[PDB]
Coordinates of C-alpha atoms in Angstrom, one line a residue:
Chain A
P1 CA -0.2 -0.2 -0.2
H2 CA 1.8 3.2 -1.5
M3 CA 0.2 7.0 -0.2
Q4 CA 0.2 9.8 -2.0
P5 CA 3.4 11.3 -2.1
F6 CA 3.9 15.2 -2.6
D7 CA 6.2 17.8 -2.6
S8 CA 8.8 19.2 0.2
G9 CA 9.0 22.3 -2.3
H10 CA 12.6 22.1 -3.3
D11 CA 14.1 23.9 -6.4
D12 CA 17.2 21.9 -5.3
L13 CA 18.2 18.0 -4.4
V14 CA 16.7 17.1 -0.8
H15 CA 19.5 15.5 1.5
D16 CA 18.0 14.7 4.6
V17 CA 14.5 13.9 6.1
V18 CA 14.1 13.6 9.6
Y19 CA 11.5 12.7 11.9
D20 CA 10.5 14.0 15.0
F21 CA 10.5 11.8 18.9
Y22 CA 6.9 11.9 18.2
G23 CA 6.6 10.4 14.3
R24 CA 4.0 13.3 13.9
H25 CA 6.7 15.5 12.3
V26 CA 9.9 15.8 10.2
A27 CA 12.4 17.9 9.1
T28 CA 14.4 18.3 5.2
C29 CA 16.8 20.1 4.2
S30 CA 18.6 20.4 0.7
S31 CA 20.6 21.9 -2.1
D32 CA 18.7 25.5 -1.9
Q33 CA 20.0 26.0 1.3
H34 CA 16.7 25.9 2.9
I35 CA 14.9 23.1 6.4
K36 CA 11.4 22.6 5.0
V37 CA 9.6 21.1 8.4
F38 CA 6.3 19.6 8.1
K39 CA 3.7 18.4 9.6
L40 CA 0.9 15.1 9.8
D41 CA -2.4 16.7 9.6
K42 CA -4.7 14.6 12.2
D43 CA -7.8 14.9 11.2
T44 CA -6.8 15.1 7.0
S45 CA -4.0 12.5 7.4
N46 CA -1.9 14.8 4.9
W47 CA 1.4 15.2 5.7
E48 CA 1.4 19.8 5.7
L49 CA 3.9 22.5 5.5
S50 CA 4.3 23.6 8.6
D51 CA 7.2 26.4 7.4
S52 CA 10.0 26.3 5.1
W53 CA 13.1 29.3 5.4
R54 CA 16.4 30.4 4.5
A55 CA 19.2 28.9 6.4
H56 CA 21.6 28.0 4.8
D57 CA 24.5 30.2 2.0
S58 CA 25.4 27.1 0.9
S59 CA 24.1 23.0 0.7
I60 CA 22.8 21.6 4.1
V61 CA 23.2 17.9 4.3
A62 CA 22.4 17.2 7.9
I63 CA 19.7 17.7 10.0
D64 CA 18.0 16.9 13.4
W65 CA 15.3 16.9 16.8
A66 CA 16.4 17.2 19.7
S67 CA 15.3 15.0 22.7
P68 CA 10.9 16.9 23.5
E69 CA 12.6 17.2 26.5
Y70 CA 14.5 20.3 25.0
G71 CA 12.1 21.7 23.7
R72 CA 11.2 22.1 20.5
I73 CA 14.9 22.0 18.6
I74 CA 16.7 21.5 15.4
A75 CA 19.9 21.4 14.4
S76 CA 22.3 22.0 10.6
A77 CA 25.0 20.9 9.0
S78 CA 25.8 22.7 5.7
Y79 CA 28.9 22.9 2.7
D80 CA 28.9 26.2 4.3
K81 CA 31.4 25.5 7.1
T82 CA 29.0 25.4 10.0
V83 CA 25.7 24.5 12.2
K84 CA 23.3 26.4 13.3
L85 CA 20.5 25.7 16.1
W86 CA 17.4 26.5 15.4
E87 CA 13.9 26.5 18.0
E88 CA 10.6 27.0 16.6
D89 CA 8.8 30.1 18.3
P90 CA 4.7 28.1 19.4
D91 CA 4.0 32.2 18.7
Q92 CA 4.3 32.6 14.9
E93 CA 2.0 31.9 11.6
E94 CA 3.5 28.9 9.9
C95 CA 4.9 29.4 6.1
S96 CA 5.1 32.8 7.5
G97 CA 9.1 32.2 7.8
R98 CA 10.1 33.1 10.6
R99 CA 8.6 30.2 13.0
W100 CA 12.1 28.9 13.9
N101 CA 14.5 31.1 15.3
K102 CA 18.3 30.3 14.8
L103 CA 20.5 30.0 19.0
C104 CA 23.2 29.8 18.0
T105 CA 25.8 29.1 15.2
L106 CA 29.0 26.8 15.7
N107 CA 31.9 28.2 13.0
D108 CA 35.2 25.8 14.6
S109 CA 34.8 23.7 12.1
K110 CA 37.1 24.1 9.0
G111 CA 36.2 22.2 6.6
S112 CA 32.4 22.0 4.8
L113 CA 30.5 19.4 7.5
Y114 CA 28.6 15.8 6.0
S115 CA 27.2 14.7 9.5
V116 CA 24.9 16.2 13.0
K117 CA 23.4 14.0 15.4
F118 CA 22.0 14.7 18.8
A119 CA 22.8 12.4 21.6
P120 CA 20.7 10.9 23.8
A121 CA 18.6 13.1 26.1
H122 CA 20.3 10.8 28.4
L123 CA 23.1 13.0 28.4
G124 CA 21.5 16.3 28.6
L125 CA 21.5 18.2 25.1
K126 CA 24.9 17.6 23.1
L127 CA 25.8 17.0 20.2
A128 CA 27.9 15.8 17.6
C129 CA 29.3 16.7 13.5
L130 CA 31.6 15.9 11.2
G131 CA 33.3 17.4 8.5
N132 CA 36.3 17.9 5.2
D133 CA 38.1 18.5 7.9
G134 CA 38.8 15.0 9.6
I135 CA 37.7 16.3 12.7
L136 CA 34.1 15.3 15.1
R137 CA 32.8 17.7 17.2
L138 CA 30.9 17.1 20.0
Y139 CA 29.4 20.7 21.6
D140 CA 27.4 20.6 24.7
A141 CA 24.3 23.1 26.3
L142 CA 25.6 22.5 29.7
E143 CA 22.8 25.7 30.6
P144 CA 19.9 23.7 29.6
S145 CA 17.9 26.9 30.0
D146 CA 20.5 28.9 28.2
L147 CA 20.1 27.9 24.8
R148 CA 22.0 29.4 23.4
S149 CA 25.3 28.3 25.9
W150 CA 26.5 25.9 23.6
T151 CA 30.4 25.3 24.3
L152 CA 32.8 23.2 23.1
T153 CA 33.4 19.2 24.6
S154 CA 35.5 17.7 22.4
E155 CA 37.8 17.0 19.6
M156 CA 38.9 14.5 17.9
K157 CA 40.9 13.7 14.3
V158 CA 39.0 10.5 12.9
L159 CA 41.3 10.7 9.5
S160 CA 45.1 11.9 11.0
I161 CA 45.4 13.6 8.0
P162 CA 42.6 13.8 6.4
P163 CA 43.0 13.5 2.9
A164 CA 41.5 16.5 1.3
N165 CA 40.8 15.5 -2.7
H166 CA 37.6 15.3 -5.6
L167 CA 35.9 15.9 -2.4
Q168 CA 34.9 11.7 -3.3
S169 CA 34.6 11.5 0.8
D170 CA 31.7 10.6 3.1
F171 CA 31.5 10.7 6.8
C172 CA 28.5 9.2 9.4
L173 CA 28.1 9.8 12.5
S174 CA 25.2 8.0 14.7
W175 CA 25.3 7.3 19.1
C176 CA 24.5 4.3 20.6
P177 CA 20.4 5.4 21.9
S178 CA 20.5 2.9 24.8
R179 CA 20.4 4.3 27.9
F180 CA 21.8 2.0 30.5
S181 CA 25.3 1.3 27.9
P182 CA 28.1 3.6 28.8
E183 CA 28.0 6.9 26.7
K184 CA 29.8 6.0 23.0
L185 CA 28.7 7.1 19.1
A186 CA 30.1 5.6 15.6
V187 CA 31.9 7.4 13.5
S188 CA 32.3 6.7 9.2
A189 CA 35.5 8.5 7.5
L190 CA 35.5 6.9 4.0
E191 CA 35.8 3.5 4.2
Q192 CA 37.1 3.2 8.3
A193 CA 33.7 2.9 9.7
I194 CA 35.2 4.0 13.9
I195 CA 33.5 3.2 17.4
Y196 CA 34.4 6.1 20.4
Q197 CA 33.1 4.9 24.0
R198 CA 33.4 7.9 26.8
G199 CA 36.1 7.3 29.5
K200 CA 36.7 7.5 32.9
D201 CA 39.2 10.3 32.3
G202 CA 35.2 12.4 30.6
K203 CA 38.1 12.1 27.1
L204 CA 36.1 9.9 23.8
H205 CA 38.7 7.0 23.1
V206 CA 38.8 4.8 20.0
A207 CA 37.8 1.6 21.5
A208 CA 36.7 -0.4 18.2
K209 CA 36.6 -0.7 14.6
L210 CA 34.0 -2.0 12.4
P211 CA 35.8 -4.1 9.2
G212 CA 35.4 -5.5 6.3
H213 CA 34.8 -2.4 4.4
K214 CA 35.8 -2.2 0.5
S215 CA 35.0 1.6 -0.3
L216 CA 33.0 4.4 1.2
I217 CA 30.4 3.9 3.9
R218 CA 27.5 5.8 2.8
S219 CA 25.1 5.0 5.9
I220 CA 25.6 3.7 9.1
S221 CA 23.0 3.8 12.4
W222 CA 23.1 2.3 15.8
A223 CA 20.0 0.1 16.8
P224 CA 17.1 1.0 19.4
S225 CA 19.0 -2.0 22.1
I226 CA 15.4 -2.7 23.7
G227 CA 15.7 -6.0 25.6
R228 CA 19.0 -6.4 24.3
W229 CA 22.9 -7.0 26.1
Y230 CA 25.1 -6.0 22.7
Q231 CA 24.7 -3.8 21.1
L232 CA 24.2 -4.1 16.7
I233 CA 24.9 -1.8 14.5
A234 CA 24.5 -1.8 10.7
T235 CA 26.0 0.4 7.8
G236 CA 25.4 0.7 4.3
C237 CA 28.8 0.7 1.8
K238 CA 29.4 1.8 -1.6
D239 CA 30.7 -1.8 -2.5
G240 CA 27.0 -2.4 -2.6
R241 CA 26.7 -4.5 1.1
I242 CA 23.9 -4.6 4.4
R243 CA 26.8 -4.9 7.6
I244 CA 24.9 -5.4 10.9
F245 CA 27.8 -5.6 13.9
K246 CA 27.0 -7.5 16.9
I247 CA 29.3 -5.6 19.4
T248 CA 29.4 -7.0 22.8
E249 CA 31.4 -5.5 26.1
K250 CA 32.2 -8.1 28.8
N251 CA 36.6 -3.8 26.2
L252 CA 33.7 -4.2 23.2
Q253 CA 33.8 -7.2 21.6
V254 CA 33.2 -6.9 17.8
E255 CA 31.4 -10.2 15.7
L256 CA 29.8 -9.8 13.0
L257 CA 26.5 -11.7 12.6
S258 CA 24.9 -10.7 8.3
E259 CA 26.4 -8.6 5.0
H260 CA 23.7 -8.8 2.4
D261 CA 24.2 -8.1 -1.6
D262 CA 20.6 -7.9 -2.7
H263 CA 21.2 -4.5 -3.2
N264 CA 23.6 -4.8 -6.5
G265 CA 25.0 -1.4 -6.0
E266 CA 25.6 0.8 -3.4
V267 CA 23.3 1.4 -0.3
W268 CA 22.6 4.4 0.0
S269 CA 20.2 4.3 3.6
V270 CA 20.3 2.2 6.0
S271 CA 17.8 2.8 9.2
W272 CA 16.2 1.4 12.5
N273 CA 13.6 0.9 13.8
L274 CA 11.8 2.8 17.3
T275 CA 12.4 -0.6 19.1
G276 CA 15.4 -2.0 16.7
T277 CA 13.2 -4.4 15.6
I278 CA 13.2 -3.2 11.8
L279 CA 16.7 -2.2 9.7
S280 CA 15.8 -1.4 6.7
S281 CA 18.1 -0.2 3.9
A282 CA 17.7 1.8 0.1
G283 CA 19.7 1.6 -2.6
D284 CA 20.6 1.9 -6.5
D285 CA 18.0 -1.0 -6.7
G286 CA 14.8 1.7 -6.2
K287 CA 14.1 0.0 -3.9
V288 CA 13.5 -0.5 0.1
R289 CA 14.3 -3.6 2.2
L290 CA 13.0 -4.4 5.5
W291 CA 15.4 -7.1 7.9
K292 CA 13.5 -9.0 10.8
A293 CA 16.4 -10.7 12.9
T294 CA 16.2 -14.7 13.1
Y295 CA 15.5 -16.5 16.4
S296 CA 19.6 -17.5 15.3
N297 CA 19.9 -13.1 15.0
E298 CA 20.8 -13.8 11.8
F299 CA 18.3 -11.1 9.6
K300 CA 16.1 -12.6 6.8
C301 CA 15.0 -9.5 4.8
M302 CA 11.1 -9.7 5.2
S303 CA 9.7 -7.3 2.7
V304 CA 10.7 -4.6 -0.6
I305 CA 9.7 -2.2 -1.9
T306 CA 10.1 -0.3 -4.8
Chain B
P1 CA 14.9 66.6 -6.0
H2 CA 13.5 63.2 -6.6
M3 CA 10.1 62.7 -3.7
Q4 CA 8.0 59.9 -5.6
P5 CA 5.1 58.2 -4.0
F6 CA 5.8 54.3 -3.4
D7 CA 3.9 51.8 -2.5
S8 CA 4.1 50.3 1.6
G9 CA 3.9 46.7 0.6
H10 CA 0.3 46.1 2.8
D11 CA -2.5 44.2 0.7
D12 CA -5.3 46.3 3.8
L13 CA -5.6 50.0 4.6
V14 CA -2.8 51.9 6.1
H15 CA -3.7 53.9 9.5
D16 CA -0.7 55.3 10.7
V17 CA 2.8 56.0 9.5
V18 CA 5.7 57.8 12.4
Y19 CA 9.4 58.7 12.0
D20 CA 11.6 57.6 14.1
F21 CA 14.2 60.7 16.1
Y22 CA 15.6 61.6 13.3
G23 CA 13.3 61.7 10.6
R24 CA 15.6 59.2 9.2
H25 CA 13.2 56.4 9.0
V26 CA 9.0 55.9 9.4
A27 CA 7.1 52.5 10.6
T28 CA 3.8 51.4 9.1
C29 CA 1.3 49.7 10.0
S30 CA -2.0 48.8 8.4
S31 CA -4.8 46.4 8.7
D32 CA -3.1 43.4 6.9
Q33 CA -1.4 42.7 10.5
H34 CA 1.5 43.9 8.7
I35 CA 4.8 46.9 10.3
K36 CA 7.1 47.8 7.6
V37 CA 9.8 49.8 8.5
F38 CA 11.3 51.8 6.1
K39 CA 14.8 53.3 5.2
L40 CA 16.4 56.3 3.9
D41 CA 18.8 55.5 1.8
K42 CA 22.0 58.6 2.2
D43 CA 24.0 57.2 -1.6
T44 CA 20.0 57.4 -3.2
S45 CA 17.9 59.9 -1.6
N46 CA 14.5 57.3 -1.6
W47 CA 13.1 55.3 0.8
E48 CA 13.5 51.6 1.0
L49 CA 11.9 49.1 2.7
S50 CA 14.1 47.5 5.9
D51 CA 11.9 44.6 7.2
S52 CA 8.2 44.3 7.0
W53 CA 6.7 41.1 9.6
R54 CA 3.0 39.8 10.7
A55 CA 2.8 41.6 13.6
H56 CA -0.8 41.3 15.5
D57 CA -3.9 38.8 14.9
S58 CA -6.0 41.6 13.8
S59 CA -5.6 45.1 12.2
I60 CA -2.6 46.7 13.9
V61 CA -4.3 50.8 14.0
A62 CA -1.3 52.7 16.0
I63 CA 2.7 52.3 16.2
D64 CA 5.5 54.3 17.0
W65 CA 8.8 55.4 18.3
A66 CA 10.7 55.2 21.4
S67 CA 13.2 57.1 22.3
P68 CA 16.5 56.7 21.0
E69 CA 18.6 56.5 24.0
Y70 CA 16.7 53.5 25.3
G71 CA 17.3 51.7 22.1
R72 CA 15.8 51.0 19.1
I73 CA 11.8 50.1 19.5
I74 CA 8.7 49.9 18.2
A75 CA 5.3 50.0 20.2
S76 CA 2.4 48.9 18.7
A77 CA -1.7 48.2 19.3
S78 CA -4.3 46.5 17.0
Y79 CA -7.6 45.9 17.0
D80 CA -6.4 42.3 18.8
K81 CA -6.5 43.9 22.6
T82 CA -3.2 44.3 22.6
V83 CA -0.1 46.3 22.3
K84 CA 3.2 44.8 20.8
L85 CA 6.5 45.8 21.9
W86 CA 9.6 45.4 19.5
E87 CA 13.1 45.8 19.5
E88 CA 15.7 45.8 15.9
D89 CA 18.5 43.2 16.4
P90 CA 21.3 44.9 13.9
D91 CA 21.8 41.5 13.3
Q92 CA 20.1 39.6 11.2
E93 CA 19.5 41.1 7.2
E94 CA 16.8 43.5 5.9
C95 CA 13.4 42.5 4.9
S96 CA 13.8 39.1 6.7
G97 CA 10.9 39.8 8.5
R98 CA 13.4 38.2 11.5
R99 CA 15.1 41.9 12.1
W100 CA 12.5 42.9 14.8
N101 CA 12.2 40.7 17.6
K102 CA 8.8 40.7 19.9
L103 CA 9.8 41.7 23.6
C104 CA 7.0 42.0 25.0
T105 CA 2.8 42.0 24.5
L106 CA 0.7 43.6 26.8
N107 CA -3.4 41.9 27.4
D108 CA -4.8 43.8 30.5
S109 CA -7.2 46.0 27.5
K110 CA -10.4 43.6 27.3
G111 CA -11.5 46.5 23.6
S112 CA -10.1 47.2 20.7
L113 CA -6.6 49.3 21.2
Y114 CA -6.9 52.7 18.8
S115 CA -4.0 54.4 20.5
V116 CA -0.6 54.1 21.7
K117 CA 2.1 56.9 22.7
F118 CA 5.7 56.6 24.4
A119 CA 6.6 59.4 26.7
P120 CA 8.7 62.1 26.6
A121 CA 11.9 60.6 27.1
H122 CA 12.5 62.1 30.1
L123 CA 10.4 60.3 31.4
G124 CA 11.5 56.4 30.7
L125 CA 10.5 54.1 28.8
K126 CA 6.4 54.8 29.1
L127 CA 3.6 54.6 27.5
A128 CA 0.4 54.9 27.0
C129 CA -3.0 53.3 25.6
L130 CA -6.5 53.4 25.1
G131 CA -9.0 51.5 23.4
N132 CA -13.2 50.2 23.8
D133 CA -12.8 49.6 27.0
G134 CA -12.3 53.3 26.9
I135 CA -9.8 52.7 29.8
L136 CA -6.0 54.4 29.7
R137 CA -3.0 52.2 30.9
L138 CA 0.4 53.5 31.4
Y139 CA 3.8 51.1 31.3
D140 CA 6.9 50.8 32.5
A141 CA 9.8 49.7 31.9
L142 CA 11.3 50.0 35.3
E143 CA 14.7 48.2 34.7
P144 CA 16.2 49.5 31.7
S145 CA 18.1 46.8 31.1
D146 CA 15.0 44.6 30.9
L147 CA 13.2 46.1 28.0
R148 CA 10.0 42.7 28.3
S149 CA 9.9 44.3 32.6
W150 CA 6.8 45.8 31.5
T151 CA 4.7 47.4 34.6
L152 CA 1.3 48.6 33.9
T153 CA 2.1 52.4 36.7
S154 CA -1.6 52.9 36.1
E155 CA -4.9 52.7 34.9
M156 CA -8.2 56.0 34.1
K157 CA -11.3 55.5 33.5
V158 CA -11.7 58.0 30.5
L159 CA -15.2 57.1 30.0
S160 CA -17.3 57.2 32.5
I161 CA -19.2 54.1 31.1
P162 CA -17.0 52.8 28.5
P163 CA -20.9 52.1 26.6
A164 CA -19.9 51.7 23.0
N165 CA -22.3 50.3 19.4
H166 CA -19.0 49.9 18.3
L167 CA -19.7 50.9 14.9
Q168 CA -19.0 54.7 15.9
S169 CA -15.9 54.7 17.9
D170 CA -12.5 56.9 18.6
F171 CA -9.6 57.6 20.6
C172 CA -6.7 59.9 20.5
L173 CA -3.1 60.3 23.4
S174 CA -0.7 63.0 22.8
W175 CA 1.6 63.4 25.4
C176 CA 2.7 66.5 26.7
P177 CA 6.7 66.9 25.0
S178 CA 7.9 69.6 26.9
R179 CA 11.2 68.7 28.9
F180 CA 11.1 70.9 32.6
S181 CA 6.6 70.7 32.4
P182 CA 4.8 68.9 33.9
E183 CA 3.8 65.3 33.4
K184 CA 0.8 65.7 31.4
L185 CA -0.8 63.8 28.1
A186 CA -4.0 64.4 26.5
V187 CA -6.5 62.1 25.6
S188 CA -9.8 62.2 23.3
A189 CA -12.6 60.4 23.3
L190 CA -15.6 60.5 20.5
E191 CA -17.3 63.8 21.5
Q192 CA -15.1 64.9 24.2
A193 CA -11.6 65.5 24.7
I194 CA -9.2 66.0 28.8
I195 CA -5.8 66.3 29.9
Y196 CA -4.2 64.3 32.5
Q197 CA -1.3 66.1 34.7
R198 CA 0.7 63.9 37.2
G199 CA 0.4 64.6 40.9
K200 CA 2.4 64.7 44.3
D201 CA 0.2 61.5 45.0
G202 CA 2.3 59.6 41.6
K203 CA -1.7 59.3 40.1
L204 CA -3.3 61.0 36.9
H205 CA -6.1 63.7 38.2
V206 CA -8.4 65.1 35.5
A207 CA -6.4 68.7 35.1
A208 CA -8.9 70.2 32.3
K209 CA -10.8 70.0 29.2
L210 CA -10.8 70.8 25.2
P211 CA -14.3 71.8 25.0
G212 CA -16.2 73.0 22.3
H213 CA -15.7 69.8 19.7
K214 CA -19.2 68.9 18.4
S215 CA -18.4 65.7 16.5
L216 CA -15.9 62.4 16.8
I217 CA -12.8 63.2 17.2
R218 CA -9.7 62.6 14.4
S219 CA -7.3 63.6 15.6
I220 CA -4.6 65.7 18.5
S221 CA -1.2 66.3 19.4
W222 CA -0.2 68.4 22.0
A223 CA 3.5 70.0 19.8
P224 CA 6.6 71.2 21.0
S225 CA 7.0 74.5 23.8
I226 CA 10.4 74.8 22.6
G227 CA 10.9 78.7 24.0
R228 CA 6.8 79.2 24.8
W229 CA 6.2 78.6 28.3
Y230 CA 2.5 77.5 27.4
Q231 CA 1.5 74.7 26.4
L232 CA -0.5 74.1 22.7
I233 CA -2.7 71.2 21.9
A234 CA -4.4 70.7 18.6
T235 CA -7.6 68.9 17.4
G236 CA -8.5 68.1 14.1
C237 CA -12.8 67.0 14.5
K238 CA -14.8 65.0 12.6
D239 CA -17.4 68.9 12.6
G240 CA -14.6 69.8 10.2
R241 CA -13.0 72.4 12.0
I242 CA -9.2 71.9 13.7
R243 CA -8.7 73.6 16.6
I244 CA -6.1 75.0 18.9
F245 CA -5.7 75.7 22.1
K246 CA -3.9 77.3 24.8
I247 CA -3.6 76.0 28.2
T248 CA -1.4 78.2 30.7
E249 CA -0.9 76.9 34.3
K250 CA -1.0 79.6 37.3
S251 CA -1.6 73.5 39.3
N252 CA -4.3 74.3 38.3
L253 CA -5.5 75.5 34.1
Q254 CA -6.3 77.7 32.6
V255 CA -8.1 77.2 28.8
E256 CA -8.3 79.1 25.5
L257 CA -9.5 78.1 22.5
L258 CA -7.0 80.1 19.7
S259 CA -7.7 79.3 16.8
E260 CA -10.4 77.2 14.9
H261 CA -10.5 76.5 10.6
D262 CA -12.9 75.1 8.7
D263 CA -11.1 75.5 5.6
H264 CA -11.5 71.8 5.3
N265 CA -15.0 71.7 5.0
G266 CA -15.9 68.0 5.9
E267 CA -13.7 65.8 8.3
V268 CA -9.9 66.8 9.9
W269 CA -8.3 63.1 9.9
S270 CA -4.7 64.2 10.7
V271 CA -3.2 67.0 13.3
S272 CA 0.6 66.8 12.7
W273 CA 3.2 69.3 14.5
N274 CA 7.2 70.4 13.6
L275 CA 9.5 69.6 16.0
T276 CA 9.8 72.5 16.8
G277 CA 6.4 73.2 17.3
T278 CA 6.7 76.0 14.9
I279 CA 4.0 74.7 12.3
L280 CA 1.0 72.7 12.4
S281 CA -0.5 70.3 9.9
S282 CA -3.9 69.5 9.2
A283 CA -5.5 66.7 6.8
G284 CA -9.3 65.5 6.0
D285 CA -11.7 64.7 3.2
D286 CA -10.6 67.9 0.4
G287 CA -7.7 65.7 -0.6
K288 CA -5.5 68.0 0.8
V289 CA -3.1 69.2 3.9
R290 CA -2.4 72.7 4.9
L291 CA 0.3 74.5 6.9
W292 CA -0.4 76.7 10.5
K293 CA 1.8 79.0 11.3
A294 CA 1.1 81.7 14.3
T295 CA 1.0 85.4 14.0
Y296 CA 2.7 87.9 16.0
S297 CA -0.2 88.3 18.3
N298 CA -1.1 84.2 18.7
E299 CA -4.2 83.3 16.2
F300 CA -2.7 81.2 13.4
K301 CA -2.3 81.6 9.5
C302 CA -2.8 79.3 6.8
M303 CA 1.4 79.6 5.1
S304 CA 0.0 77.2 2.3
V305 CA -1.7 74.3 1.4
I306 CA -0.7 71.6 -0.5
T307 CA -2.9 68.9 -2.2

């Protein structure tokens, strides 16, 4: 059952679409340097533009919503080397172009930015970003009252020497959602994919790598480990394979659970369920595949949308 | 050189246009619930839109700028029973619709609002408003640092009762600009026009009335009394007459009527003063603007008619 598609309202290509916490809102960002937010009308089950606005001087590539317990906040990353934060002002008409106020700007990056992800709420307003400079940066809104008070918490050189050629480069972030697991996050930078963990010293250290990728990692996402003791992160590589890694900490162990080339071409998007019960993958073949785990913990394709 | 008209950019009728302190900026408010601010480009002596934005849920009728010594602040009154204050954020692109941030909202009024006027700077950020509820209200930004800290300073029942069919009502405000004169302001409410003065008890009391109006007072403004000791306030009535009252305080107030002029033959909608209170303007149905200067005898004479 397909539903009535709709126009985003963007002129240039759209890079990311993201859901709010409740799944009733979506934020869109494209190259036309705009961020659009759609609302899912209760009555007429249709998606309808809540507000659109110009937000960056260059192409906006990444986007993300903060936990509802900190307000209505969106974050954006652009090729203009910045990350901007916005907060919805309910006292403005929708579509007015002025429904979301910039709360701040992060200019520390000296290279374009490809990704930005808020951290799990149980760690406060925190976030990460990664760009050409090959330097992952974490920021913290130390005082949850001042949603402008964004301090820089950490800086790590993912690539020792960022190659810097033919912008044939890719980077991705994904925090470990787990509430009852030590703070950590995954990062992909080209062929490599590495995991960081908070130490007793309050600093990030590299705790492992997800080996096997023979090309560019287009996407990666940590799955919600509700119920499980272990962690699972999936990656969609350019070599045309979905990979699912089981990470156990007894400090971290790394198993490869599955590999799937069903896409025959690059896997662009890899996404998870809210319960981490279903995993999605999309690619060149112009198809989306949904995967469930077997009783043996292998992964099986439960359906193919096209 | 180049005094050509220009479009405001409003869809519905425009109610008020106001100049900033320096005369280089203008704020416009219309029924389309927008407030536009124009800039007078130094180089090309043209007026060009600085920023426009939706500010009220209903028709915006009045507007006004605060003294430059408190920042870039505008105040607006609407039929939506509110008065909003805005402060310009120089760190925003012009025309972005995001150049003026709401600093506060005053909801105390239970009837639509027709007028709002900032008080003379020598009294702090203070302001007044009047609406259907027939209750004039003064607000004070007690701490000039917190341009959100707007407290309510006073409430006075102008029209004993606020009756109204809401089909023929008008209200106007105008503070006495004078720096070396006791705080006071004029208020028009329909046929009546009354003056309030601050007492020793820090409360407003009615110190006089400007008698003679035989219809609705569309406009009134106190003139800058630079050089003079007496005060002069003019009113443009619907009965088609401009009136200029000389008010002297010998503190109790005297009231003389200096001039009456029907040259307009129809209602006088706008009555305005000079920065020195040297020239008085009037506009009306006849589609003409008249400028008036005072004679040596203190009568007023029409020194020109624009059409």
